[PDB]
Amino acid sequence: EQHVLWHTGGKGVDLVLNSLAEEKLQASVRCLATHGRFLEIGKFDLSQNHPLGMAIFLKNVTFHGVLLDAFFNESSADWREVWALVQ
Amino acid sequence: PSAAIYNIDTSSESPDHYLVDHTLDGRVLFPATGYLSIVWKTLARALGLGVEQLPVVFEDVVLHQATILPKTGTVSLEVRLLEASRAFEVSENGNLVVSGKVYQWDDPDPRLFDHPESPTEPLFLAQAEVYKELRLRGYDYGPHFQGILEASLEGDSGRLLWKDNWVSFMDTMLQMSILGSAKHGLYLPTRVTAIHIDPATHRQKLYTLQDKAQVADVVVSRWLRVTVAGGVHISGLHTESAPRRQQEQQVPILEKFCFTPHTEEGCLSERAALQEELQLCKGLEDPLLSGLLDSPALKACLDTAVENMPSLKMKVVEVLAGHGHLYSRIPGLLSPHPLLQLSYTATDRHPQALEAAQAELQQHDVAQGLVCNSLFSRVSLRLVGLKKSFYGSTLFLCRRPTPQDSPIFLPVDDTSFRWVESLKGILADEDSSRPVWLKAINCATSGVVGLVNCLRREPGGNRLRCVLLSNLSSTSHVPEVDPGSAELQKVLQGDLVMNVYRDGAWGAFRHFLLEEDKPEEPTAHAFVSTLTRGDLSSIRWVCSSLRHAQPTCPGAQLCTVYYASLNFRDIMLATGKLSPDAIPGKWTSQDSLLGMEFSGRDASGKRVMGLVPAKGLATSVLLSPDFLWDVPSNWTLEEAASVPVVYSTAYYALVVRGRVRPGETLLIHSGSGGVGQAAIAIALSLGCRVFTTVGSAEKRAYLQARFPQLDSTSFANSRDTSFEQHVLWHTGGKGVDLVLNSLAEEKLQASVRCLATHGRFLEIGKFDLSQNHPLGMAIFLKNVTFHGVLLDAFFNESSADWREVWALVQAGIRDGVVRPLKCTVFHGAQVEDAFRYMAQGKHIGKVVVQVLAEEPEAVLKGAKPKLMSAISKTFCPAHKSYIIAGGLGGFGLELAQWLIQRGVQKLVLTSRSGIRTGYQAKQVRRWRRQGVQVQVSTSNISSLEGARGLIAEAAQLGPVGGVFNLAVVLRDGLLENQTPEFFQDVCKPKYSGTLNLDRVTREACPELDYFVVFSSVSCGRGNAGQSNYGFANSAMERICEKRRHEGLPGLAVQWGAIGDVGIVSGTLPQRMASCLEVLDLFLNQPHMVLSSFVLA
Amino acid sequence: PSAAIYNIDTSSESPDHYLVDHTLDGRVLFPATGYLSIVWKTLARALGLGVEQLPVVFEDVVLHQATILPKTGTVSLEVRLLEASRAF
């Protein structure tokens, strides 16, 4: 957190691809810049229903819960897009 | 036993007596770190360890309420902590005030307290000016909390005192954190992320100075959002501004200083009631009976009598006080004069009168037994003044005869002040008992008025200096008069302290006349603002800064406004719940911030509508052409005023951010609101299934009439959480795809429980986000996206997305998707009514203000706004230059800041030395970073060549607009018995300097419009020690009078005691904010010399 | 005094003998609603009212651990509640 906040001039980053556990997810969300996007691909912190402070959304921030497992049941329209991108 | 209770006593003997030094704003508040101290003590007691042996860690500290400490009383705080849950709470009357987490560190790492390296100077900021700045900002800290020993200019490094007190130490760390940040108003901490304390490292990080004091180093890092000092480490401090108490403990006594002739003939004219009443009585207590009684003519006579009173003591006797009622006005008129002991007695020949005993109880006395409403010579009295009007009534006044002889005449009219020794010799012997008559003849530019005022109260020879002879013929040698033995006889017959001949008439200068209410001028550019914060009855039209400066840069354009729309932010700002600093933008100048959209005509007369970040409610708006749309021919401007912000927010939320696809389910909260209606229209145009929560049945009926594609299954109730069950049952337990939420707590959770898989939550509310309420992150297992949507971010940067939003809005306007809402029209003279109407949520659609009626034409070029009367205000063009003489210290810096906030881009400051103190350097650096070019010059003002060079240097930057004289040299404490010629000579840098300024401005300053000099009360009321000071100030007023008579601008202000920059003559210090406010009021007045002071 | 302590005994004479019928999997576990019962009783005692006279509301109940009831022994549960914070 201190490293990125010092090497970006106190602005932060635009995208965070987070796969770390508690007391590090909060650090990661504290590294977000304005109009930042948080991409959560972890499971433990989500499965335990840990709290999240909603004051971070005053920075015009988007929070994403990303799970690839949902494509094996329905919604093949997005899977075609992903397949085309991979190809 | 689990609840530890702490009693807080602020008595002189209590161990917690130091808390009396925490007076953030007229109120003693418990320090935010006192809660941490007591929680730490409670945890240490629970663990059975001492505080100094327990390294502790705080997390997610939240403050919910402010604790006020009464002077006579005691408050109790109960703290309970859950060791298993690792939490704590603080409550007073069972009401939560602090919550968070606390636990033992049990593994202290000293590397956490290493000072981070700064991203980036002999000058530094010392304690006195640091706390002067804090006092100016609002913080009235006391000696116990004044722990900042030294601070850097930018406020990122310094030194902190250690007094074996953690509360004061942490309060000083917070003070250092808030010092550097530049915000207007007081900011109190509300949320802190983490605090670490390691007392062993704290003791290891302390060093001693030569003064045998213990200090620690503090650094503040804004990039890392961390404040570390000694063994304390605060991270993620959050502060929010609090409203001003508005104590208004500085009531300004305001007057004007005028020359009053002794014999006023035909006064009380140009009236209204008296003129008609004269013929009404001719055809056929009372205004006609008392016309001159309430006029300021009586006040001048009363002031003259007071000045004639030998000592401050005065005895007044009322005769026949059974019919007349002048006893109810004389005591009131003497209140403004400070240090006056008045004994008033009412005597009536008939004791049966005087039934108003309660009126006499207002500091008056009763009794039973010269002013009255060829017999004068029979009593052998001397007539001083006569007041005759169109009432035939006459007001007389006779002096008290006091025989005297040996009239000493001393010619004061002379340079080099060699007469001072002669005056000392005349006033040397105490056993003189002979009047002294000062004479000024060959120079109307004499300040002997102030000298006689100050010398008259001198200890020893007080009554010796009796009167002056000043010939102030303020004309181009038009009149002519010369003194002499015959001329002296008329003056010497009446022993009057003041004897002034002004262009034909003999009289005296009066400092008793009061002032009037606000001035108004007819202008074409104005806006609306709340004169007093939080009051909706103080909303009026105020002249704007767009008239003086209209640069109209390529990325700007000036448009005339016909209709303006009101929003919720406007209500919050007007009623005071919202702070002006929450508005995003460079709004460091206190001004109106009301309005976000408008409709009218541009420079070419094209009918245009647009969106602005602020200052929407105005007669004209300057904005970039990017934030503009063309009104279609089928629309009128009235309904066009309601489109921009609503549809912009709706499109940005739905299309740009939500990326809604046709054939989806949406939940739109508060469907009757503007944003709700726009979202409904967009979703229906895209062909989507829509659920809307509605407040009442009438709103449901209106929505059904407006959108015929909605059925009875699409409506829910917005006043509770039943909409969750409704949507979950009508969607078969699946939920909706998009939620446009604008509802508060216990309804946001219900809304998020209505989300389906791959759902998108669009949050456009603020309260629940501002309070940092928790959100369960188990909802993200449903592959859900959470959106925080704020349109305000587009007014600063990232125009790429704004172009997309603009294109979407334009495309919607091209087809029939975008429809104007219904509007309620309020005229421009009823803005208060509009605010009151919208304050209650009984309206449907939009509330708009008709600034100007729409013309029937289509392209009306040259649409000059109609003239409108508004409150006058002072603004300056950006192409001019202004000079402040001696403005590099005290009042000068504050005046320069005030002028800069009013639109000044070129400043020249003169001082004997350079920038010496760190405060001046900090102010100059901050002003230079703002884009204002400021020059400090060492050119003298008393020399002709120095004044010419200074004026040339100022003109090099640009045309000179105004000159402000603030230079002062104080040879004070100089009684007349020890006053030499040299000291009174050196006490005149604002005499030769002012004369040179006058001459040079008259020579080569044809665009000048401001000419301001700063006087003092001692020039009109007198002070013992400042004789030469008053002498300078009086003639500095005289020159202003002459230059005003000549037609050029001229103003002199008599200031009382001024605080925030350090009682004189019984006058309390005046706060800087009130000083600037009264200065702004004075600058628009038509009088030449004005006074301002606070009575003791 | 703020911490109410409850002793759970599964003996044949104890009033809480019926808890022996909770054997989810070869193990006697404290019922998830026994916690609600004891918290309700503690709140009623704190308010000075009977359980049958106190309508109560629970919110955001989270279970962190499973309590095993030994056949020969006794476990003690301490319940503490913060009236101002409205938690337990």
Numbering used by the authors:
A (entry chain B): 1729 to 1815
B (entry chain A): 857 to 976, 981 to 1144, 1211 to 1295, 1313 to 1316, 1379 to 2067, 2079 to 2112
C (entry chain B): 857 to 944
Any passages from the paper?
In mammals, fatty acid synthase (FASN) contains multiple enzymatic domains to catalyse all chemical reactions needed for de novo fatty acid synthesis. An ACP carries substrates from one enzyme to another, sequentially following the chemical reactions. In metazoans, all essential enzymes are included in a single polypeptide chain and are arranged into two main functional domains, each carrying out a key chemical process and named correspondingly the condensing and modifying domains. The entire cycle of fatty acid synthesis requires that ACP carries the substrate from one enzyme to another repeatedly. Here, using a strategy of tagging and purifying endogenous FASN in HEK293T cells for single-particle cryo-electron microscopy studies, we characterized the structural dynamics of endogenous human FASN.
Focusing on these subsets, we refined the condensing and modifying wings separately to high resolutions with the best to 2.5 Å and 2.7 Å, respectively, from the 1,3-DBP sample. From these two separate reconstructions, we generated a composite map of human FASN incubated with 1,3-DBP, in which an ACP is seen bound to the KS domain. This composite map is of sufficient quality for accurate modelling of most of the modifying and condensing wings. For the modifying wing, we also applied symmetry expansion followed by 3D classification to separate particles of the modifying domain into two main categories, with (about 32%) and without (about 68%) well-resolved Ψ-domains attaching to β-ketoreductase (KR). Comparison between the two reveals motions of the Ψ-domains against the rest of the modifying domain, which remains stable. Both KR and Ψ−KR have a Rossmann-like fold, containing two α-helical domains separated by a β-sheet. Indeed, we observed that the β-sheet of KR serves as a hinge allowing progressively increased motion from Ψ−KR towards Ψ−methyltransferase (Ψ−ME). ACP is linked to KR in the modifying wing with a short linker.
